[PDB]
Amino acid sequence: DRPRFSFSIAAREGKARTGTIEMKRGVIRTPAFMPVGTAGADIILGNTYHLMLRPGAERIAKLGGLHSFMGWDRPILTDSGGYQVMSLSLTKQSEEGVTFKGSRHMLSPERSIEIQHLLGSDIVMAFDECTPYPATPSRAASSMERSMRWAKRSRDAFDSRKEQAENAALFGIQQGSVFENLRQQSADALAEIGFDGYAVGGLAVGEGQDEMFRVLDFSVPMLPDDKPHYLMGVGKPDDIVGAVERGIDMFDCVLPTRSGRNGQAFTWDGPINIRNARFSEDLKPLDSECHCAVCQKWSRAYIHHLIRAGEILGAMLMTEHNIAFYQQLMQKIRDSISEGRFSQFAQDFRARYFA
Amino acid sequence: DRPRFSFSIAAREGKARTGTIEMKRGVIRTPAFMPVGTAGADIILGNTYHLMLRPGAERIAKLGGLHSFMGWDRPILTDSGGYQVMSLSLTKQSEEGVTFKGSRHMLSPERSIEIQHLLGSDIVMAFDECTPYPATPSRAASSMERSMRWAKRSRDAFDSRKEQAENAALFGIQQGSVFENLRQQSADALAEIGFDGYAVGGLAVGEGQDEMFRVLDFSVPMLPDDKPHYLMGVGKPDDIVGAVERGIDMFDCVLPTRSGRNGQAFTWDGPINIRNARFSEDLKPLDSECHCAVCQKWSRAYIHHLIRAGEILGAMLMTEHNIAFYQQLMQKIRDSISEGRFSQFAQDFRARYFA
Ligand SMILES: Cc1ccc(CCc2c3nc[nH]c3cc3c(=O)[nH]c(N)nc23)cc1
Ligand SMILES: Cc1ccc(CCc2c3nc[nH]c3cc3c(=O)[nH]c(N)nc23)cc1
Ligand SMILES: [Zn+2]
Ligand SMILES: [Zn+2]
Numbered sequence: 001d002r003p004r005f006s007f008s009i010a011a012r013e014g015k016a017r018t019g020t021i022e023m024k025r026g027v028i029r030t031p032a033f034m035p036v037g038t039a040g041a042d043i044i045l046g047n048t049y050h051l052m053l054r055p056g057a058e059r060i061a062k063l064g065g066l067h068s069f070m071g072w073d074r075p076i077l078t079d080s081g082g083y084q085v086m087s088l089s090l091t092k093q094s095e096e097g098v099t100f101k102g103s104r105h106m107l108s109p110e111r112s113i114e115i116q117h118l119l120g121s122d123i124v125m126a127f128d129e130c131t132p133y134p135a136t137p138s139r140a141a142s143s144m145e146r147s148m149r150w151a152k153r154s155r156d157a158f159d160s161r162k163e164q165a166e167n168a169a170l171f172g173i174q175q176g177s178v179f180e181n182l183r184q185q186s187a188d189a190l191a192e193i194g195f196d197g198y199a200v201g202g203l204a205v206g207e208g209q210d211e212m213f214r215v216l217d218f219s220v221p222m223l224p225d226d227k228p229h230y231l232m233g234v235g236k237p238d239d240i241v242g243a244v245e246r247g248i249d250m251f252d253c254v255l256p257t258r259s260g261r262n263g264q265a266f267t268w269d270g271p272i273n274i275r276n277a278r279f280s281e282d283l284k285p286l287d288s289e290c291h292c293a294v295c296q297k298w299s300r301a302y303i304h305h306l307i308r309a310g311e312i313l314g315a316m317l318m319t320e321h322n323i324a325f326y327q328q329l330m331q332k333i334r335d336s337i338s339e340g341r342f343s344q345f346a347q348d349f350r351a352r353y354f355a
Numbered sequence: 356d357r358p359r360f361s362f363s364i365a366a367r368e369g370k371a372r373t374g375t376i377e378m379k380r381g382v383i384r385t386p387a388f389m390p391v392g393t394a395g396a397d398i399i400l401g402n403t404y405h406l407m408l409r410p411g412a413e414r415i416a417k418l419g420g421l422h423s424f425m426g427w428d429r430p431i432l433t434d435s436g437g438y439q440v441m442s443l444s445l446t447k448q449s450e451e452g453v454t455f456k457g458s459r460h461m462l463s464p465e466r467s468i469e470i471q472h473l474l475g476s477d478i479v480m481a482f483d484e485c486t487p488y489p490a491t492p493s494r495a496a497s498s499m500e501r502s503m504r505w506a507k508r509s510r511d512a513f514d515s516r517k518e519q520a521e522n523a524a525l526f527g528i529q530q531g532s533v534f535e536n537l538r539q540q541s542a543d544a545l546a547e548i549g550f551d552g553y554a555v556g557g558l559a560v561g562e563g564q565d566e567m568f569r570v571l572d573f574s575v576p577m578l579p580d581d582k583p584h585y586l587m588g589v590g591k592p593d594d595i596v597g598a599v600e601r602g603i604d605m606f607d608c609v610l611p612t613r614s615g616r617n618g619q620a621f622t623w624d625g626p627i628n629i630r631n632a633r634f635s636e637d638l639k640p641l642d643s644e645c646h647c648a649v650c651q652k653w654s655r656a657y658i659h660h661l662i663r664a665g666e667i668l669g670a671m672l673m674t675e676h677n678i679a680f681y682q683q684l685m686q687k688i689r690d691s692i693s694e695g696r697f698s699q700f701a702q703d704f705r706a707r708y709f710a
Pocket of ligand 2: 435
């Protein structure tokens with residue numbers, strides 16, 4: 001029987017590492033990409049913010065939990081909901097939590113953990129504040145300090161629910177904006193509380209890749225080495241490669257699905273916009289090396305035709321290819337680290353992706 | 356090696372029959388449902404009118420023909436294009452053909468057959484005029500007479516193209532609106548020319564089921580018994596069952612795909628609108644007996660959730676289920692005719708579908 005949670009590192013190269021997370025519902029190979037569930041992957045993302053509202057967490061629990069609801073019996077990660085509340089909802093912030101608007105709702109550390117319990121997710125995120133960017137040192141500090149108080153409240157709420165404490169895992173989220181001293185204080189606070197994994201929050205908020213990598217350079221080494229590192233909200237293939245080079249083990253990102261519904265396909269030679277007329281007679285698959293079922297069977301010209309015609313089949317094929325591309329990217333990353341040639345892979349990847 | 360075209364009737368019950376069409380690219384079991392290709396089926400529909408315009412028939416031929424383009428190596432049926440021109444395009448009609456509007460286009464019997472040749476379809480429809488409904492006897496007669504002149508021109512154009520004459524099949528289309536004498540004259544004209552199959556045109560144009568069935572009652576027996584009978588544009592499951600009872604062998608219909616993108620699922624207990632709140636907690640599959648992969652795996656509640664959330668996955672699952680339902684309907688029809696219990700099947704089908 002697999003454990004509740006066990007992270008093992010099988011190989012390293014520089015700051016990069018590759019290994020596995022064992023959980024009751026399955027093994028997660030790292031570095032991992034975690035696609036949205038409503039879009040092969042070892043874990044998918046649930047959408048706490050949406051599910052809170054439709055049908056409601058209680059209702060999901062009445063229907064048997066998210067695994068039964070979605071027909072997915074493997075691990076599920078849920079975010080804590082405040083990021084989405086603050087980006088999508090009127091909002092009122094206080095030390096207790098956030099209220100937002102049919103009727104009004106409060107979201108607190110305790111309520112966030114309970115919602116994630118009712119959904120039945122396997123990896124639960126602490127309830128944090130994603131500090132807006134840019135932020136002054138004072139505002140970034142005040143925000144991070146609140147998030148750390150909230151992290152302790154999240155820990156206690158999780159531990160109070162036996163079914164959750166015994167079968168799920170809890171990740172703490174580091175904040176501190178772009179400031180090294182605050183990132184250190186946040187890492188220290190999270191390690192004192194103790195979590196199963198550690199996320200780097202507060203990035204992919206408009207800072208750009210150079211700045212993101214700069215913050216990762218000093219921030220990831222502050223986290224416990226023997227625990228998984230999750231960079232929230234990232235990203236493009238080139239962001240993933242550089243974040244793995246800096247010690248990240250887990251990724252989520254809307255882009256594969258967003259791109260698949262909006263005409264963009266990822267390839268080893270960079271993204272392409274399949275609606276462009278240059279693809280109307282292109283008999284090659286979306287990508288020349290991709291092993292996915294779309295590229296085994298259909299051409300750029302046909303997918304172009306479907307998308308231009310407004311056919312649902314087109315977006316479905318684009319999305320299948322994109323998620324498959326991301327999983328091939330992660331497999332190549334894992335294999336290259338395990339083989340000690342990840343540094344060469346990253347250089348080769350970049351030379352070709354940007355050519 | 357299969358023949359170019361061979362229709363064999365294996366069993367009959369009343370006017371209903373079941374059998375096979377053999378063509379070079381495959382066997383078609385009848386009665387057959389023929390789904391749109393861009394949406395198991397033995398033949399799919401190409402969209403002549405759309406393909407004429409984007410990318411153009413020449414361009415499709417340059418890309419290797421529709422089979423290669425779509426990745427479908429089995430039979431393809433194409434319509435002749437005038438129905439769609441007259442419903443979707445400014446139009447100018449003459450004895451030569453129809454002109455319509457970027458720039459202008461003409462469609463004639465000769466051009467329609469050439470377009471269908473360039474597309475490479477296996478079953479080619481004659482270029483006809485679908486008479487509007489209602490029509491006076493005089494207008495219905497004038498229109499039908501033009502269609503029969505056009506049917507002869509279609510026959511001659513098809514026969515002039517060796518690759519087409521030797522590898523494809525040509526169907527003539529009966530017109531005559533709702534008038535028995537004109538339907539007879541049209542059938543007589545088509546049989547004198549000689550076709551591989553015979554379609555009943557000019558229905559599913561707003562006449563309603565009672566009137567459609569009334570016209571089928573006298574029209575289908577006018578066609579050669581030993582050739583397939585294709586009712587164009589039909590229809591709902593109950594239309595299909597009644598048309599088979601009246602001697603129809605082949606069906607096309609937008610409904611499965613249109614419905615799948617618009618929240619409607621077909622079930623043995625009738626259509627359901629999955630967006631309705633009554634399905635938000637319904638743990639049953641879309642249909643309790645359906646063998647399709649959607650109903651094996653997911654609930655009404657989950658598909659409702661996806662559609663209400665605007666997720667592409669939802670429409671895809673609805674469409675897969677709907678096309679699968681139609682193929683199960685046709686399999687049950689074929690089996691019940693072969694077993695001599697089709698009359699009982701139709702009564703049982705109706706009692707339940709409308710309960
Ligand atoms: C469905 C879904 C997908 C992804 C996410 C992650 C959302 C996300 C961020 N996205 C971009 N930058 C982000 C930063 C944070 C952050 O600091 N905290 C949290 N809790 N989430 C973040 C949430 C929900
Ligand atoms: C993609 C596609 C699907 C289906 C069709 C069939 C379109 C269709 C009719 N649809 C409803 N009633 C119809 C009558 C006729 C008719 O009399 N003639 C022709 N040529 N087509 C018909 C054409 C193209
Ligand atoms: Zn692919
Ligand atoms: Zn089904």
